[PDB]
JSON list of C-alpha atoms and ligand atoms in Angstrom, two decimals:
[
{"chain": "A", "resi": 2, "resn": "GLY", "atom": "CA", "xyz": [-8.47, -58.76, 91.60]},
{"chain": "A", "resi": 3, "resn": "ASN", "atom": "CA", "xyz": [-9.74, -57.52, 94.78]},
{"chain": "A", "resi": 4, "resn": "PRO", "atom": "CA", "xyz": [-11.95, -59.96, 96.77]},
{"chain": "A", "resi": 5, "resn": "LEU", "atom": "CA", "xyz": [-16.02, -58.98, 97.01]},
{"chain": "A", "resi": 6, "resn": "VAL", "atom": "CA", "xyz": [-17.89, -60.10, 100.19]},
{"chain": "A", "resi": 7, "resn": "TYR", "atom": "CA", "xyz": [-21.42, -59.55, 101.46]},
{"chain": "A", "resi": 8, "resn": "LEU", "atom": "CA", "xyz": [-23.32, -58.59, 104.81]},
{"chain": "A", "resi": 9, "resn": "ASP", "atom": "CA", "xyz": [-26.98, -59.37, 105.01]},
{"chain": "A", "resi": 10, "resn": "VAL", "atom": "CA", "xyz": [-28.32, -57.23, 107.52]},
{"chain": "A", "resi": 11, "resn": "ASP", "atom": "CA", "xyz": [-31.78, -56.96, 109.73]},
{"chain": "A", "resi": 12, "resn": "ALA", "atom": "CA", "xyz": [-32.91, -54.38, 111.94]},
{"chain": "A", "resi": 13, "resn": "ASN", "atom": "CA", "xyz": [-35.27, -55.81, 114.49]},
{"chain": "A", "resi": 14, "resn": "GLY", "atom": "CA", "xyz": [-35.65, -59.07, 112.93]},
{"chain": "A", "resi": 15, "resn": "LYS", "atom": "CA", "xyz": [-36.72, -57.45, 109.34]},
{"chain": "A", "resi": 16, "resn": "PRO", "atom": "CA", "xyz": [-34.41, -57.77, 106.27]},
{"chain": "A", "resi": 17, "resn": "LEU", "atom": "CA", "xyz": [-32.78, -54.53, 104.97]},
{"chain": "A", "resi": 18, "resn": "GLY", "atom": "CA", "xyz": [-30.93, -56.13, 102.32]},
{"chain": "A", "resi": 19, "resn": "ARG", "atom": "CA", "xyz": [-27.27, -56.46, 101.18]},
{"chain": "A", "resi": 20, "resn": "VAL", "atom": "CA", "xyz": [-24.12, -54.77, 100.95]},
{"chain": "A", "resi": 21, "resn": "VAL", "atom": "CA", "xyz": [-21.65, -56.10, 98.91]},
{"chain": "A", "resi": 22, "resn": "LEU", "atom": "CA", "xyz": [-18.03, -54.71, 99.79]},
{"chain": "A", "resi": 23, "resn": "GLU", "atom": "CA", "xyz": [-14.78, -54.53, 97.62]},
{"chain": "A", "resi": 24, "resn": "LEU", "atom": "CA", "xyz": [-11.61, -55.19, 99.82]},
{"chain": "A", "resi": 25, "resn": "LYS", "atom": "CA", "xyz": [-8.49, -53.50, 98.42]},
{"chain": "A", "resi": 26, "resn": "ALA", "atom": "CA", "xyz": [-6.11, -56.25, 98.69]},
{"chain": "A", "resi": 27, "resn": "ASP", "atom": "CA", "xyz": [-3.88, -54.59, 96.10]},
{"chain": "A", "resi": 28, "resn": "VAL", "atom": "CA", "xyz": [-3.15, -52.03, 98.77]},
{"chain": "A", "resi": 29, "resn": "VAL", "atom": "CA", "xyz": [-3.36, -53.25, 101.76]},
{"chain": "A", "resi": 30, "resn": "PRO", "atom": "CA", "xyz": [-3.23, -57.14, 101.87]},
{"chain": "A", "resi": 31, "resn": "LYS", "atom": "CA", "xyz": [-3.35, -57.69, 105.49]},
{"chain": "A", "resi": 32, "resn": "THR", "atom": "CA", "xyz": [-6.22, -55.73, 106.17]},
{"chain": "A", "resi": 33, "resn": "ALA", "atom": "CA", "xyz": [-7.91, -56.90, 103.28]},
{"chain": "A", "resi": 34, "resn": "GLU", "atom": "CA", "xyz": [-7.37, -60.63, 104.31]},
{"chain": "A", "resi": 35, "resn": "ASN", "atom": "CA", "xyz": [-8.74, -60.08, 107.75]},
{"chain": "A", "resi": 36, "resn": "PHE", "atom": "CA", "xyz": [-12.03, -58.84, 107.01]},
{"chain": "A", "resi": 37, "resn": "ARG", "atom": "CA", "xyz": [-12.28, -61.92, 103.99]},
{"chain": "A", "resi": 38, "resn": "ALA", "atom": "CA", "xyz": [-11.96, -64.05, 106.65]},
{"chain": "A", "resi": 39, "resn": "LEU", "atom": "CA", "xyz": [-14.38, -62.76, 109.28]},
{"chain": "A", "resi": 40, "resn": "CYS", "atom": "CA", "xyz": [-16.96, -62.70, 106.67]},
{"chain": "A", "resi": 41, "resn": "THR", "atom": "CA", "xyz": [-16.41, -66.44, 105.63]},
{"chain": "A", "resi": 42, "resn": "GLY", "atom": "CA", "xyz": [-16.35, -67.48, 109.57]},
{"chain": "A", "resi": 43, "resn": "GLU", "atom": "CA", "xyz": [-13.03, -69.76, 108.37]},
{"chain": "A", "resi": 44, "resn": "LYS", "atom": "CA", "xyz": [-10.92, -69.20, 111.48]},
{"chain": "A", "resi": 45, "resn": "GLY", "atom": "CA", "xyz": [-14.34, -70.35, 113.49]},
{"chain": "A", "resi": 46, "resn": "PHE", "atom": "CA", "xyz": [-15.06, -66.78, 114.44]},
{"chain": "A", "resi": 47, "resn": "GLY", "atom": "CA", "xyz": [-16.10, -64.01, 112.72]},
{"chain": "A", "resi": 48, "resn": "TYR", "atom": "CA", "xyz": [-18.77, -61.34, 111.96]},
{"chain": "A", "resi": 49, "resn": "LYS", "atom": "CA", "xyz": [-22.42, -63.42, 111.29]},
{"chain": "A", "resi": 50, "resn": "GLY", "atom": "CA", "xyz": [-24.67, -62.89, 114.19]},
{"chain": "A", "resi": 51, "resn": "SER", "atom": "CA", "xyz": [-22.79, -59.36, 115.46]},
{"chain": "A", "resi": 52, "resn": "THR", "atom": "CA", "xyz": [-24.30, -56.08, 115.36]},
{"chain": "A", "resi": 53, "resn": "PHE", "atom": "CA", "xyz": [-24.09, -52.73, 113.96]},
{"chain": "A", "resi": 54, "resn": "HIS", "atom": "CA", "xyz": [-23.51, -51.19, 117.98]},
{"chain": "A", "resi": 55, "resn": "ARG", "atom": "CA", "xyz": [-22.68, -47.47, 116.97]},
{"chain": "A", "resi": 56, "resn": "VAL", "atom": "CA", "xyz": [-24.83, -45.49, 114.22]},
{"chain": "A", "resi": 57, "resn": "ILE", "atom": "CA", "xyz": [-24.31, -41.69, 113.87]},
{"chain": "A", "resi": 58, "resn": "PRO", "atom": "CA", "xyz": [-26.31, -40.18, 110.97]},
{"chain": "A", "resi": 59, "resn": "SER", "atom": "CA", "xyz": [-24.03, -38.21, 108.61]},
{"chain": "A", "resi": 60, "resn": "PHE", "atom": "CA", "xyz": [-20.90, -40.14, 109.50]},
{"chain": "A", "resi": 61, "resn": "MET", "atom": "CA", "xyz": [-20.89, -43.46, 109.56]},
{"chain": "A", "resi": 62, "resn": "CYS", "atom": "CA", "xyz": [-22.38, -46.84, 110.50]},
{"chain": "A", "resi": 63, "resn": "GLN", "atom": "CA", "xyz": [-19.82, -49.33, 113.03]},
{"chain": "A", "resi": 64, "resn": "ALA", "atom": "CA", "xyz": [-20.02, -52.98, 113.67]},
{"chain": "A", "resi": 65, "resn": "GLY", "atom": "CA", "xyz": [-17.77, -55.87, 114.09]},
{"chain": "A", "resi": 66, "resn": "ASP", "atom": "CA", "xyz": [-17.49, -56.64, 117.95]},
{"chain": "A", "resi": 67, "resn": "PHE", "atom": "CA", "xyz": [-18.14, -60.10, 117.92]},
{"chain": "A", "resi": 68, "resn": "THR", "atom": "CA", "xyz": [-17.00, -60.44, 121.20]},
{"chain": "A", "resi": 69, "resn": "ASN", "atom": "CA", "xyz": [-18.02, -58.77, 123.87]},
{"chain": "A", "resi": 70, "resn": "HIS", "atom": "CA", "xyz": [-21.28, -57.04, 121.46]},
{"chain": "A", "resi": 71, "resn": "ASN", "atom": "CA", "xyz": [-20.54, -53.66, 123.42]},
{"chain": "A", "resi": 72, "resn": "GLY", "atom": "CA", "xyz": [-17.71, -51.77, 121.17]},
{"chain": "A", "resi": 73, "resn": "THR", "atom": "CA", "xyz": [-14.94, -52.72, 123.85]},
{"chain": "A", "resi": 74, "resn": "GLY", "atom": "CA", "xyz": [-14.06, -55.92, 121.93]},
{"chain": "A", "resi": 75, "resn": "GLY", "atom": "CA", "xyz": [-13.44, -58.06, 118.29]},
{"chain": "A", "resi": 76, "resn": "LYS", "atom": "CA", "xyz": [-10.00, -59.59, 117.46]},
{"chain": "A", "resi": 77, "resn": "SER", "atom": "CA", "xyz": [-8.29, -60.26, 113.74]},
{"chain": "A", "resi": 78, "resn": "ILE", "atom": "CA", "xyz": [-7.26, -63.26, 112.63]},
{"chain": "A", "resi": 79, "resn": "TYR", "atom": "CA", "xyz": [-3.66, -62.40, 113.50]},
{"chain": "A", "resi": 80, "resn": "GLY", "atom": "CA", "xyz": [-4.18, -61.73, 117.17]},
{"chain": "A", "resi": 81, "resn": "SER", "atom": "CA", "xyz": [-6.45, -59.51, 119.25]},
{"chain": "A", "resi": 82, "resn": "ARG", "atom": "CA", "xyz": [-4.92, -56.36, 117.60]},
{"chain": "A", "resi": 83, "resn": "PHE", "atom": "CA", "xyz": [-2.65, -55.77, 114.77]},
{"chain": "A", "resi": 84, "resn": "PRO", "atom": "CA", "xyz": [-0.82, -52.96, 113.27]},
{"chain": "A", "resi": 85, "resn": "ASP", "atom": "CA", "xyz": [-1.94, -49.89, 110.80]},
{"chain": "A", "resi": 86, "resn": "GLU", "atom": "CA", "xyz": [-0.66, -51.43, 107.57]},
{"chain": "A", "resi": 87, "resn": "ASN", "atom": "CA", "xyz": [-0.98, -47.87, 105.50]},
{"chain": "A", "resi": 88, "resn": "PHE", "atom": "CA", "xyz": [-2.59, -44.53, 105.22]},
{"chain": "A", "resi": 89, "resn": "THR", "atom": "CA", "xyz": [-2.48, -44.98, 101.38]},
{"chain": "A", "resi": 90, "resn": "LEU", "atom": "CA", "xyz": [-6.33, -44.88, 100.84]},
{"chain": "A", "resi": 91, "resn": "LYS", "atom": "CA", "xyz": [-8.28, -42.22, 101.93]},
{"chain": "A", "resi": 92, "resn": "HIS", "atom": "CA", "xyz": [-12.04, -41.35, 103.41]},
{"chain": "A", "resi": 93, "resn": "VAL", "atom": "CA", "xyz": [-13.05, -39.85, 99.97]},
{"chain": "A", "resi": 94, "resn": "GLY", "atom": "CA", "xyz": [-17.00, -39.86, 100.43]},
{"chain": "A", "resi": 95, "resn": "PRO", "atom": "CA", "xyz": [-19.82, -42.32, 100.90]},
{"chain": "A", "resi": 96, "resn": "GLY", "atom": "CA", "xyz": [-19.33, -45.99, 101.06]},
{"chain": "A", "resi": 97, "resn": "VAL", "atom": "CA", "xyz": [-15.87, -46.14, 102.38]},
{"chain": "A", "resi": 98, "resn": "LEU", "atom": "CA", "xyz": [-14.96, -48.93, 104.31]},
{"chain": "A", "resi": 99, "resn": "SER", "atom": "CA", "xyz": [-12.55, -48.40, 107.22]},
{"chain": "A", "resi": 100, "resn": "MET", "atom": "CA", "xyz": [-11.04, -49.87, 110.36]},
{"chain": "A", "resi": 101, "resn": "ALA", "atom": "CA", "xyz": [-12.48, -48.84, 113.75]},
{"chain": "A", "resi": 102, "resn": "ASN", "atom": "CA", "xyz": [-9.45, -48.42, 116.33]},
{"chain": "A", "resi": 103, "resn": "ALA", "atom": "CA", "xyz": [-8.76, -47.47, 119.82]},
{"chain": "A", "resi": 104, "resn": "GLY", "atom": "CA", "xyz": [-5.70, -45.76, 119.09]},
{"chain": "A", "resi": 105, "resn": "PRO", "atom": "CA", "xyz": [-2.67, -46.03, 116.56]},
{"chain": "A", "resi": 106, "resn": "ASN", "atom": "CA", "xyz": [-1.73, -49.79, 115.89]},
{"chain": "A", "resi": 107, "resn": "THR", "atom": "CA", "xyz": [-4.90, -51.57, 117.58]},
{"chain": "A", "resi": 108, "resn": "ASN", "atom": "CA", "xyz": [-6.75, -52.75, 114.63]},
{"chain": "A", "resi": 109, "resn": "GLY", "atom": "CA", "xyz": [-8.90, -55.78, 115.61]},
{"chain": "A", "resi": 110, "resn": "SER", "atom": "CA", "xyz": [-12.53, -56.89, 113.68]},
{"chain": "A", "resi": 111, "resn": "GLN", "atom": "CA", "xyz": [-14.67, -53.34, 114.18]},
{"chain": "A", "resi": 112, "resn": "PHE", "atom": "CA", "xyz": [-14.73, -51.71, 110.98]},
{"chain": "A", "resi": 113, "resn": "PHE", "atom": "CA", "xyz": [-17.04, -48.38, 109.73]},
{"chain": "A", "resi": 114, "resn": "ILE", "atom": "CA", "xyz": [-18.89, -47.62, 106.47]},
{"chain": "A", "resi": 115, "resn": "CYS", "atom": "CA", "xyz": [-19.01, -44.24, 105.95]},
{"chain": "A", "resi": 116, "resn": "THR", "atom": "CA", "xyz": [-21.82, -42.10, 104.84]},
{"chain": "A", "resi": 117, "resn": "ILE", "atom": "CA", "xyz": [-20.17, -39.00, 103.68]},
{"chain": "A", "resi": 118, "resn": "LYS", "atom": "CA", "xyz": [-16.68, -37.82, 103.17]},
{"chain": "A", "resi": 119, "resn": "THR", "atom": "CA", "xyz": [-14.86, -38.25, 106.62]},
{"chain": "A", "resi": 120, "resn": "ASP", "atom": "CA", "xyz": [-11.41, -36.73, 105.44]},
{"chain": "A", "resi": 121, "resn": "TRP", "atom": "CA", "xyz": [-10.72, -35.70, 109.30]},
{"chain": "A", "resi": 122, "resn": "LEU", "atom": "CA", "xyz": [-9.82, -39.49, 109.71]},
{"chain": "A", "resi": 123, "resn": "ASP", "atom": "CA", "xyz": [-7.33, -39.47, 106.98]},
{"chain": "A", "resi": 124, "resn": "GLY", "atom": "CA", "xyz": [-4.23, -40.97, 108.81]},
{"chain": "A", "resi": 125, "resn": "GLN", "atom": "CA", "xyz": [-6.24, -42.09, 111.59]},
{"chain": "A", "resi": 126, "resn": "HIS", "atom": "CA", "xyz": [-8.05, -45.00, 110.46]},
{"chain": "A", "resi": 127, "resn": "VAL", "atom": "CA", "xyz": [-6.80, -47.39, 107.83]},
{"chain": "A", "resi": 128, "resn": "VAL", "atom": "CA", "xyz": [-9.59, -47.52, 104.70]},
{"chain": "A", "resi": 129, "resn": "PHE", "atom": "CA", "xyz": [-9.26, -50.81, 103.29]},
{"chain": "A", "resi": 130, "resn": "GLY", "atom": "CA", "xyz": [-12.33, -51.33, 101.10]},
{"chain": "A", "resi": 131, "resn": "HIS", "atom": "CA", "xyz": [-15.54, -49.61, 99.33]},
{"chain": "A", "resi": 132, "resn": "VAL", "atom": "CA", "xyz": [-19.40, -50.50, 98.96]},
{"chain": "A", "resi": 133, "resn": "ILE", "atom": "CA", "xyz": [-19.76, -51.81, 95.56]},
{"chain": "A", "resi": 134, "resn": "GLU", "atom": "CA", "xyz": [-23.85, -52.84, 95.91]},
{"chain": "A", "resi": 135, "resn": "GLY", "atom": "CA", "xyz": [-26.12, -51.85, 98.84]},
{"chain": "A", "resi": 136, "resn": "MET", "atom": "CA", "xyz": [-25.42, -48.25, 99.54]},
{"chain": "A", "resi": 137, "resn": "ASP", "atom": "CA", "xyz": [-29.08, -47.79, 99.81]},
{"chain": "A", "resi": 138, "resn": "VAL", "atom": "CA", "xyz": [-29.00, -50.68, 102.77]},
{"chain": "A", "resi": 139, "resn": "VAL", "atom": "CA", "xyz": [-26.43, -48.33, 104.21]},
{"chain": "A", "resi": 140, "resn": "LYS", "atom": "CA", "xyz": [-28.85, -45.53, 104.06]},
{"chain": "A", "resi": 141, "resn": "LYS", "atom": "CA", "xyz": [-31.36, -47.56, 105.76]},
{"chain": "A", "resi": 142, "resn": "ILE", "atom": "CA", "xyz": [-28.67, -48.71, 108.46]},
{"chain": "A", "resi": 143, "resn": "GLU", "atom": "CA", "xyz": [-28.14, -44.95, 108.92]},
{"chain": "A", "resi": 144, "resn": "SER", "atom": "CA", "xyz": [-31.45, -44.31, 109.89]},
{"chain": "A", "resi": 145, "resn": "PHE", "atom": "CA", "xyz": [-31.76, -46.16, 113.00]},
{"chain": "A", "resi": 146, "resn": "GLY", "atom": "CA", "xyz": [-28.57, -44.44, 114.45]},
{"chain": "A", "resi": 147, "resn": "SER", "atom": "CA", "xyz": [-28.69, -41.12, 116.40]},
{"chain": "A", "resi": 148, "resn": "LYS", "atom": "CA", "xyz": [-26.33, -38.28, 117.37]},
{"chain": "A", "resi": 149, "resn": "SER", "atom": "CA", "xyz": [-24.70, -40.37, 120.34]},
{"chain": "A", "resi": 150, "resn": "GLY", "atom": "CA", "xyz": [-24.43, -43.67, 117.95]},
{"chain": "A", "resi": 151, "resn": "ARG", "atom": "CA", "xyz": [-26.93, -45.52, 120.45]},
{"chain": "A", "resi": 152, "resn": "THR", "atom": "CA", "xyz": [-29.22, -47.35, 117.71]},
{"chain": "A", "resi": 153, "resn": "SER", "atom": "CA", "xyz": [-33.14, -47.40, 117.75]},
{"chain": "A", "resi": 154, "resn": "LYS", "atom": "CA", "xyz": [-33.51, -51.09, 116.47]},
{"chain": "A", "resi": 155, "resn": "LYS", "atom": "CA", "xyz": [-31.25, -54.16, 116.99]},
{"chain": "A", "resi": 156, "resn": "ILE", "atom": "CA", "xyz": [-29.30, -53.93, 113.66]},
{"chain": "A", "resi": 157, "resn": "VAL", "atom": "CA", "xyz": [-27.69, -57.77, 113.06]},
{"chain": "A", "resi": 158, "resn": "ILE", "atom": "CA", "xyz": [-25.46, -58.93, 110.60]},
{"chain": "A", "resi": 159, "resn": "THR", "atom": "CA", "xyz": [-27.62, -62.24, 109.90]},
{"chain": "A", "resi": 160, "resn": "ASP", "atom": "CA", "xyz": [-25.47, -63.55, 107.29]},
{"chain": "A", "resi": 161, "resn": "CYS", "atom": "CA", "xyz": [-21.80, -62.88, 105.67]},
{"chain": "A", "resi": 162, "resn": "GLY", "atom": "CA", "xyz": [-19.52, -64.36, 103.27]},
{"chain": "A", "resi": 163, "resn": "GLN", "atom": "CA", "xyz": [-17.40, -64.49, 99.90]},
{"chain": "A", "resi": 164, "resn": "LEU", "atom": "CA", "xyz": [-18.77, -63.83, 96.89]},
{"chain": "A", "resi": 165, "resn": "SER", "atom": "CA", "xyz": [-15.46, -64.04, 95.07]},
{"chain": "B", "resi": 1, "resn": "LIG", "atom": "N1", "xyz": [-10.07, -53.30, 118.36]},
{"chain": "B", "resi": 1, "resn": "LIG", "atom": "C1", "xyz": [-10.74, -51.98, 118.67]},
{"chain": "B", "resi": 1, "resn": "LIG", "atom": "C2", "xyz": [-11.43, -51.28, 117.97]},
{"chain": "B", "resi": 1, "resn": "LIG", "atom": "C3", "xyz": [-12.12, -50.30, 118.33]},
{"chain": "B", "resi": 1, "resn": "LIG", "atom": "C4", "xyz": [-12.20, -49.95, 119.43]},
{"chain": "B", "resi": 1, "resn": "LIG", "atom": "C5", "xyz": [-13.08, -48.98, 120.05]},
{"chain": "B", "resi": 1, "resn": "LIG", "atom": "N2", "xyz": [-13.08, -47.92, 119.86]},
{"chain": "B", "resi": 1, "resn": "LIG", "atom": "C6", "xyz": [-13.79, -47.24, 119.17]},
{"chain": "B", "resi": 1, "resn": "LIG", "atom": "O1", "xyz": [-14.81, -47.38, 119.07]},
{"chain": "B", "resi": 1, "resn": "LIG", "atom": "N3", "xyz": [-13.29, -45.84, 118.71]},
{"chain": "B", "resi": 1, "resn": "LIG", "atom": "C7", "xyz": [-13.66, -44.65, 117.64]},
{"chain": "B", "resi": 1, "resn": "LIG", "atom": "C8", "xyz": [-13.72, -45.37, 116.21]},
{"chain": "B", "resi": 1, "resn": "LIG", "atom": "O2", "xyz": [-12.64, -46.55, 116.10]},
{"chain": "B", "resi": 1, "resn": "LIG", "atom": "N4", "xyz": [-14.72, -44.94, 115.20]},
{"chain": "B", "resi": 1, "resn": "LIG", "atom": "C9", "xyz": [-14.66, -44.74, 113.79]},
{"chain": "B", "resi": 1, "resn": "LIG", "atom": "C10", "xyz": [-15.68, -43.71, 113.35]},
{"chain": "B", "resi": 1, "resn": "LIG", "atom": "C11", "xyz": [-16.51, -43.77, 114.38]},
{"chain": "B", "resi": 1, "resn": "LIG", "atom": "C12", "xyz": [-15.47, -43.59, 115.71]},
{"chain": "B", "resi": 1, "resn": "LIG", "atom": "C13", "xyz": [-15.04, -42.36, 116.15]},
{"chain": "B", "resi": 1, "resn": "LIG", "atom": "C14", "xyz": [-13.98, -41.76, 115.79]},
{"chain": "B", "resi": 1, "resn": "LIG", "atom": "C15", "xyz": [-13.44, -40.57, 115.69]},
{"chain": "B", "resi": 1, "resn": "LIG", "atom": "C16", "xyz": [-14.43, -39.84, 116.46]},
{"chain": "B", "resi": 1, "resn": "LIG", "atom": "C17", "xyz": [-15.62, -40.34, 116.87]},
{"chain": "B", "resi": 1, "resn": "LIG", "atom": "C18", "xyz": [-16.12, -41.66, 116.57]},
{"chain": "B", "resi": 1, "resn": "LIG", "atom": "C19", "xyz": [-11.76, -51.49, 120.51]},
{"chain": "B", "resi": 1, "resn": "LIG", "atom": "C20", "xyz": [-11.05, -52.30, 119.85]}
]
């Protein structure tokens, strides 16, 4: 079936727990495969050690810039950027897993987990998964964000990987 991956997340060096995500390979296989491989680190790069650099309450938690750590970088397993696969899945509510971008067809590694329905992003950002467990962990991450996105503690993916 669709892969399951995990992120273990700290806030100023204190464990928050684990987020488990289903990647919807059956709808967006390319986009799903990118995230998977970046969780495992199997290409020699990926999410381990990187941060949630932009977190806004009642919107979303953004992470995945493992090259520059500032929200400008990241790269995919296909090269630095790749196209929008499709917009079949929608931003239907909390726990949606979606690709951050800098305009049409600029997916790299940056991603976000929604904390509400973000239906205004439908057709703008490729949804490619959903939280299976750890939505309480996402709420804790959310509690360290702000209107601007600037976080109040350093939110770190200490470890990540593939479960199935
Ligand atoms: N490969 C790559 C991907 C993203 C960027 C930075 N762009 C960004 O952060 N854009 C905004 C974005 O994607 N999102 C996703 C949800 C939160 C935020 C956003 C979107 C719409 C309005 C306000 C913030 C640079 C390189």
